[PDB]
């Protein structure tokens, strides 16, 4: 895949390694969404929550989906498209997750739900783009949401999805 795909992926592995060495909480203290308004101008935090992973399983499952769906968007729609999808979903899915359950969360799966959402609807409305998501998967992405409802970031997942559908919509009617 392409530069944005690999970069991200180097970013996540670097940050995971540091969590192994320093501990989750010490990376959390610097990379998590601000828990205190005093911290509101530490602008990296609105994005960096997305680099943190909490087990080998967390990271591998996330990078897998990210490489498959992010690689597809980068190659058919270009590097800038992946950046924008990434920055908006990371910002908005953090925002909603922080309201639902507080600032202590991380992982790329909010961005990934946006990628799932964007790839599916865009595959539906503009087959000419040459991206698509198999049916078997959105329904799965839907059933991963109900088990999280009953320790998943549930607001990150639905807000990510919403951002994905919206942008795809706005991108297809164009």
């Amino acid at each position: 895949a392409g530069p944005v795909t690999w970069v991200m992926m180097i970013a996540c592995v670097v940050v995971f390694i540091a969590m192994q060495i320093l501990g989750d909480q010490e990376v959390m203290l610097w990379l998590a969404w601000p828990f205190d308004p005093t911290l509101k101008f530490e602008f990296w935090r609105y994005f960096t929550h997305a680099l943190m992973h909490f087990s080998l399983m967390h990271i591998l499952f996330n990078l897998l989906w990210w490489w498959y769906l992010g690689g597809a968007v980068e190659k058919r729609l270009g590097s800038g498209k992946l950046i924008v999808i990434t920055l908006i979903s990371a910002l908005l899915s953090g925002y909603v997750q922080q309201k639902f359950s507080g600032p202590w969360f991380g992982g790329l799966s909010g961005v990934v739900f946006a990628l799932m959402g964007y790839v599916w609807l865009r595959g539906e409305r503009d087959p000419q783009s040459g991206i698509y998501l198999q049916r078997g998967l959105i329904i799965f992405a839907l059933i991963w949401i109900v088990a999280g409802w009953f320790s998943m970031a549930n607001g990150a997942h639905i807000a990510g999805l919403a951002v994905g559908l919206a942008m795809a919509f706005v991108d297809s009617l164009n």
């Binding site: 929550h49 909490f54 997750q97 202590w104 991380g106 909010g110 999280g148 998943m152 970031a153 990510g160």
Partner: peptide, 5 residues
């Protein structure tokens, strides 16, 4: 801590 998943 919640995983985004």
């Amino acid at each position: 801590v919640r995983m985004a998943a």
